[PDB]
Amino acid sequence: SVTEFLKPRLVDIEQVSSTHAKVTLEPLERGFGHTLGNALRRILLSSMPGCAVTEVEIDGVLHEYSTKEGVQEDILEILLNLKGLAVRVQGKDEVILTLNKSGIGPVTAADITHDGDVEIVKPQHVICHLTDENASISMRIKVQRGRGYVPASTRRLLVDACYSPVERIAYNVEAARVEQRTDLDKLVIEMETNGTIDPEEAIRRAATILAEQLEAFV
Amino acid sequence: TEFLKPRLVDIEQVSSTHAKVTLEPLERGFGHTLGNALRRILLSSMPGCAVTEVEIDGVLHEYSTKEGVQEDILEILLNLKGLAVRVQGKDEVILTLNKSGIGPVTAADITHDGDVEIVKPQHVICHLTDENASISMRIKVQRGRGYVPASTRIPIGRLLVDACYSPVERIAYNVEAARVEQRTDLDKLVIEMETNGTIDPEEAIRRAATILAEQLEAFVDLRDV
Amino acid sequence: EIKELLKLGDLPTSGQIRLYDGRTGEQFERPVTVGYMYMLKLNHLVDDK
Amino acid sequence: MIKGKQGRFRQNLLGKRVDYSGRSVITVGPYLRLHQCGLPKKMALELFKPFIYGKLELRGLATTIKAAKKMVEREEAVVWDILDEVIREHPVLLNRAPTLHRLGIQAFEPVLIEGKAIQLHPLVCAAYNADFDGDQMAVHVPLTLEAQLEARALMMSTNNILSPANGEPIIVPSQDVVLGLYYMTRDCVNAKGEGMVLTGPKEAERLYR
Amino acid sequence: KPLVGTGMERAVAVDSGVTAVAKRGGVVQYVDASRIVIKVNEDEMYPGEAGIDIYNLTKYTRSNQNTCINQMPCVSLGEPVERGDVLADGPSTDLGELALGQNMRVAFMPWNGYNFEDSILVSERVVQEDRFTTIHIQELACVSRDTKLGPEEITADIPNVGEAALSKLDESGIVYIGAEVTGGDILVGKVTPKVKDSSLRVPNGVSGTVIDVQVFTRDGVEKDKR
């Protein structure tokens, strides 16, 4: 009764429709919830392989603080929108796509060239707005592969790459009980992803990453 | 993409009491993560060999006092709680301390049964003021985990003492850079610890890896709803 | 004089020491006043009340 | 028989004492919710003896009442399940001695907590104006379902958020959490995370953590 | 040993006679929890009635707040000792200095709202070495008066009581010292002749361990075996 530790199992998973979800584990050893949740938070935030836009260029602009006529948005605003794009890619490291289009109205993610291997996961996602019949939007975007966040300072306009697919992760603990057990943790985890991968599998991948990091010891 | 795995690159017994160890290579972010995780577990739940029960022939109840011994029985029990022991095979054992005569009384006088090993013979239990006043006493010690007080688990002569199943007191960790290694941003993690001496550092850290892994096996075991 | 003794000690002259959280595992910004206090146990034990 | 303090009006129509009542010093347990309160497990054990007996004879663990009393005083295993069952939905009244304004009595849902002190929600303490100096608050239990309805519907914290004296929320945070929030919405001119742009608060938290 | 002293601890310590003060200087020849033996210096010692002194320590005994009070020796054998000076500290006294509480490592910050008003925060380490731990004494008394229909007996024999309750009792009907009694168990077997059971018990909800039983008898009646 010395190496024995109670084995909690997921009694439920209440996942919001698409990417937001909430997990509950119990009953846990006293205090293990804090370390477990903190480690999950840190790893999911820190080292998550993925792909994201790194650089973008417009045909007729060289300066960041500029605009193209016939576009309701601004260049920086479009950069914010593109940073909000969610995509996944084949095993290829990087590739260049374009948003060449001419028309009146919003430019959705569905308008993006498929370009074979790369697949946009949210075609509905809005990029820009065009209003003039003559205003044509054309530009190049580059997607690369990584496992972290790249501030622009860390580096043909640039785009910080959020290679970690999870957007929000948080966890709380409560005092769960068993028939006589005094104070056993129950860990509630609340998380939300871009939806490029469902939450439970991301949790699984983090678990594998740590376990292999652990496997070198025992 | 890949994540280089560390190894227990160093163990060093800086003092007979304690040691320090090193893990290498580690990459960005993992440093403080594993540092807090390992510190938390290596402080939280380890094996133990804290004394459990003490019998003394001349003692009816605890709060009495024996003739010829200057300190209180309770103070003697607290000194015993300051004792540390090492055992290998048996979960439980009975230790026997018998001694009379004027002078100090440390753990060196206890019976030295094989697996029973004293880590602090210099640990004084008490002093004796009488040439003829023999403390003769039996000490039941078994393994355990964490902190078991008397009120939890609960013979008239058998006096109960709370458990202190913990071999370590101080832990800290430091991240730092490694050699060039043809690759920068490699992180060396130095872990410093203080123990009574009853636990090997390698044993403790390996058990920490095992326990944290099987906790993560639950994360591996995530199934259904 | 207290600062004099602190200088004699290895402790910071201000005495506000950086602390590290067990739950999160990093420093607390705005380093914190820490030291030693003589608490006393009052004679109001919860079981009595 | 009719006059004086011993007179029946002043004898037995005045501040009396109440069975199924308890008292102890209080603590916080912030992780609790304002719709809910703490209560030491032992207090739950002694308070609800008839309730536990009823559920016991319903389950037929010990038919006679004396045996059930023996089981509960022995603190046998199954009793805690019964306690959780009865506490599943059974709010109770928490009270302070100097009951000046009516929030000094208030309805809450207990949760079984170990230890020996009552966890009380932070903010409501301000309504109770009860510092944690060692204030000994008392506890009462309604019996009839109508009384449960009254408490859950009238004396419930959810139904008691604003003062009667006027409309200001009596649930204003007092001293500590306000410091944190003040720490939130205050600018340092230059530090990390100064001088860029974000698409939303989520990545803001991500970058902060 | 309160770290931030004021210098008044010494005066209160010496004046407050909780400790074993040294009426005269010299050396201790016998040291024990029970008592201390002092061979006063010959110059300090008077020519006539010379002798040597014995200091009697106050042992574990009842306080006035049901707390414990006790004196413990604090000097080794054959140790020089000065006049008007401590020999054995009393409660909360430390080498002749008043040690009321305990000094601990401390910090000031809001920790997860757990210290909202004054709710002090303490680590399990503090309780682990039991440094806060305190002792309390409970003096439960029982009387044997003579009523109509016979006197109140103190016999072990009680009708309708489990043998387990009787097991911890003696031949007469009184507990043995050192019993880990609990709330509810009988201590002395008292019965009102009729016969009915009126035996004393531990108060409900309080445990403990019997340290001593004092017995006094009205002059002119016998005594039981215990």
TrEMBL record, chain A:
Signal peptide: none
Enzyme class per UniProt: transferase
GO molecular function annotation: DNA binding; DNA-directed RNA polymerase activity; protein dimerization activity
Biological process according to GO: DNA-templated transcription
Record key words, sorted: DNA-directed RNA polymerase, Nucleotidyltransferase, Transcription, Transferase
Transmembrane portions of the chain: none
Statement: the UniProt record of this protein carries the keyword Transmembrane: no
EC number: 2.7.7.6
Catalysed reactions listed for this entry: RNA(n) + a ribonucleoside 5'-triphosphate = RNA(n+1) + diphosphate
Domain notes: The N-terminal domain is essential for RNAP assembly and basal transcription, whereas the C-terminal domain is involved in interaction with transcriptional regulators and with upstream promoter elements.
UniProt protein name: DNA-directed RNA polymerase subunit alpha
Native organism: Escherichia coli
Residue window of the full protein shown: 4 to 232 of 329
TrEMBL record, chain D:
Sequence positions that bind Mg(2+): D131, D133, D135
Residues of the RNA polymerase N-terminal domain: 1-185
UniProt function note: DNA-dependent RNA polymerase catalyzes the transcription of DNA into RNA using the four ribonucleoside triphosphates as substrates.
Family per record: In the C-terminal section; belongs to the RNA polymerase beta' chain family.
Assembly behavior: The RNAP catalytic core consists of 2 alpha, 1 beta, 1 beta' and 1 omega subunit. When a sigma factor is associated with the core the holoenzyme is formed, which can initiate transcription.
Protein name: DNA-directed RNA polymerase subunit beta'
Upper classification of the organism: Bacteria, Pseudomonadati, Pseudomonadota, Gammaproteobacteria, Enterobacterales
Gene coding for it: rpoC
TrEMBL record, chain E:
Family membership: Belongs to the RNA polymerase beta chain family.
Role according to the record: DNA-dependent RNA polymerase catalyzes the transcription of DNA into RNA using the four ribonucleoside triphosphates as substrates.
The protein's assembly and partners: The RNAP catalytic core consists of 2 alpha, 1 beta, 1 beta' and 1 omega subunit. When a sigma factor is associated with the core the holoenzyme is formed, which can initiate transcription.
Name of the protein in its database record: DNA-directed RNA polymerase subunit beta
Full-sequence portion shown in this chain: 697 to 944 of 1342
